[PDB]
Design a protein around this ligand. Structure first.
Ligand SMILES: CCCCCCCCCCCCCC(=O)SCCNC(=O)CCNC(=O)[C@H](O)C(C)(C)COP(=O)(O)OP(=O)(O)OC[C@H]1O[C@@H](n2cnc3c(N)ncnc32)[C@H](O)[C@@H]1OP(=O)(O)O
Ligand SMILES: CNCCCN(C)c1ncc(F)c(N2CC(C(=O)NCc3cnc4ccccn34)C2)n1
Length: 378
C-alpha cells in the first residue's frame, strides 16, 4: 500500500518511464507556498535543531545511531558511525544547520529520532539539479512502527523546500517506490580468520586463497594533501560526467570529501611531478559486533571514488584492497556501480546478501543498471 509514500511525488511501484523523460513530478513550486510552521509531533515529543559542531548535540546523535541504526538481517552487527565521521558527513560546504533535525522524548529529554540532509548538485541524465542528500534517518528501537518516520521526512522536506530546493537523492537497503537504480554489494575478505570467527563470512587454505598481494601496481600512491585538490577536482570531475547519476563537485567540495581524516576517509593519489593521474578513496564505517566475547568492532572499508589513467581498473582496485589492508581493515566493501562490477570476480570479491537502492525524490526518469551510477552515499 505504501500509505505514506503513496502521497509523495515519487514514481509508483510498477512505473516505467521512456528514455526521453527527465523532469520533476511536481514543478513550478513556490517557496511562499511551503508550510511555515513545523509539523505537529505527537504529545510528549519535541523538535530539536541539532548543532553537529556542538559536542553535546553530536554526542547525542552518535549515541542514538550507535544504539538504534541499521542492523543486519540476523542482528549480528550494527553500524557504528564515529562522531568524527558524522561531523564530516554533515558539515559539507554550504550545509544548513536547520537540515539536521532531531526529535526528543520529553519525559526523558533524550533524542529518539533524527534525519539529515546536505545540499549537493546532482546530475541526473545529464541535467544538473540542486538537491538535498538525505541520510541518517533513525528512530529509537522502542518507538518503531509508531509512524514517526513519515513526520521526520515531511518536516525535513519542508525545511529543504524553504530553501527553494525541490529534489532529493537518498539510498536505502529496503525497497521503496521506486529505485532509479539498484546495486548489490560485494565483499573482499582481508582478515579471513576474523570474518569467519564473527560470522561475517579449509581454514588454512582460505587464508592462502584470499591473501592480498603485498605490492601495489601503482607505485607512487600517497595520501592526498591539500595541494592536490585542483588535480583531484580535474581528475574526478571529468571522470564522473560519463554516468547517468553523479554529483558535480566544486573545488571546496573536493577538499571536504576527499582530504584524509583518520578512521573516516582515506584518499590516495598518484602525483607524478604535480599531476594527479590516479586516485583511490574509501571511507571507514565500523560495525559494532553485538554480544561477542573476543571482538567488539568489525573494521570495514567502503569503496568511495577510484579513478585511473595510468593503469587498468582491476589494478587500481587491487591497490585499493591492499591500501585498506595496510590500514588494518578487515573487509573491503564495494557496490556494483561505475566500473566496479568488472573487477569483482578476478579480485575474489564475494557476493553480498542484499542490494542498495538509489532513489530520487520528485524526479521522473527512466531507471538504469547500476554500472551507470557514479555516486556513492555515506
Ligand atoms: C525535496 C526534499 C525531499 C527530502 C526527503 C527525501 C526522502 C527521504 C526518505 C528517507 C531517506 C532515508 C535514507 C536513510 O537514512 S537509509 C537509513 C535507514 N535507517 C535505518 O534503517 C535505521 C534503523 N531503522 C530505523 O531507525 C527505523 O526502522 C526507520 C526510521 C528506518 C523506519 O521507521 P519505523 O520502522 O518506525 O517506521 P514508521 O512506522 O515510523 O514509518 C513507516 C513508513 O516508513 C517507511 N520507511 C521504512 N524504512 C524506510 C527508509 N529506510 N527510508 C524511507 N522510508 C522508510 C515505510 O515504507 C513506511 O511507509 P509506507 O510503507 O507506510 O509508505
Ligand atoms: C554505508 N551506508 C549505510 C546505510 C546504507 N546501507 C544499508 C548500506 N550502504 C552500503 C553498503 F555497502 C551496505 N552494505 C554492505 C553490506 C554489509 O556490510 N553487510 C553486513 C553488515 C555488517 N554490519 C552491518 C550493519 C548493518 C547491516 C549489515 N551489516 C550492507 N549497506
Amino acid at each position: 500500500d505504501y500509505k505514506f509514500w503513496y502521497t509523495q511525488p515519487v514514481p509508483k511501484i510498477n512505473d516505467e518511464f521512456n528514455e526521453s523523460v527527465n523532469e520533476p513530478f511536481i514543478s513550478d513550486n513556490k517557496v511562499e507556498d511551503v508550510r511555515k510552521d513545523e509539523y505537529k509531533l505527537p504529545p510528549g515529543y519535541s523538535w530539536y535543531v541539532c548543532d553537529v559542531k556542538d559536542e553535546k548535540d553530536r554526542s547525542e546523535i552518535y549515541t542514538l545511531l550507535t544504539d538504534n541504526y541499521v542492523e543486519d538481517d540476523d542482528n549480528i552487527f550494527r553500524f557504528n558511525y564515529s562522531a568524527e565521521f558524522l561531523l564530516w558527513a554533515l558539515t559539507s560546504p554550504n550545509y544548513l544547520k536547520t537540515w539536521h533535525i532531531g526529535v526528543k522524548y520529553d519525559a526523558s529529554n533524550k533524542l529518539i529520532g533524527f534525519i539529515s540532509a546536505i545540499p549537493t548538485d546532482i546530475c541526473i541524465h545529464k541535467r544538473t539539479i540542486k538537491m538535498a542528500e538525505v541520510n541518517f534517518l533513525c528512530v529509537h528501537k522502542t518507538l518503531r512502527s509508531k509512524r514517526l518516520a513519515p513526520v521526520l521526512i515531511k518536516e525535513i522536506t519542508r525545511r529543504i523546500n524553504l530553501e527553494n530546493i525541490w529534489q532529493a537523492i537518498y539510498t536505502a537497503g529496503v525497497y521503496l517506490p521506486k529505485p532509479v537504480s539498484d546495486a548489490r554489494y560485494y565483499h573482499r575478505s582481508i582478515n579471513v580468520k576474523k570474518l569467519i570467527e564473527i560470522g561475517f563470512s579449509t581454514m588454512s587454505r582460505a587464508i592462502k586463497l584470499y591473501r592480498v598481494e603485498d605490492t601495489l601496481n601503482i607505485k607512487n600512491m600517497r595520501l592526498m594533501k591539500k595541494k592536490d585538490v585542483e588535480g583531484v577536482h580535474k581528475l574526478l570531475g571529468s571522470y564522473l560526467e560519463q554516468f547517468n547519476l553523479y554529483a558535480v563537485f566544486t573545488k571546496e567540495e573536493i577538499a571536504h570529501w576527499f582530504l584524509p581524516i583518520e578512521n573516516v576517509i582515506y584518499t590516495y593519489v598518484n602525483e607524478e611531478n604535480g599531476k594527479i593521474k590516479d586516485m583511490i578513496s574509501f571511507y571507514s564505517l565500523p560495525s559494532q559486533i553485538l554480544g561477542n566475547d573476543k571482538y567488539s568492532t568489525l573494521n570495514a572499508a567502503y569503496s568511495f571514488y577510484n579513478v585511473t589513467t595510468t593503469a587498468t581498473f582491476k589494478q587500481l582496485m587491487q591497490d585499493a584492497i591492499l591500501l585498506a589492508k595496510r590500514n588494518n581493515f578487515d573487509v573491503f566493501n564495494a557496490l556494483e556501480v561505475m566500473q566496479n562490477k568488472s573487477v569483482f570476480e578476478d579480485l575474489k570479491f564475494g557476493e553480498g546478501d542484499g542490494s542498495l537502492k538509489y532513489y530520487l525524490y520528485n524526479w521522473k526518469c527512466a531507471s538504469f543498471a547500476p554500472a551507470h551510477v557514479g555516486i556513492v552515499l555515506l
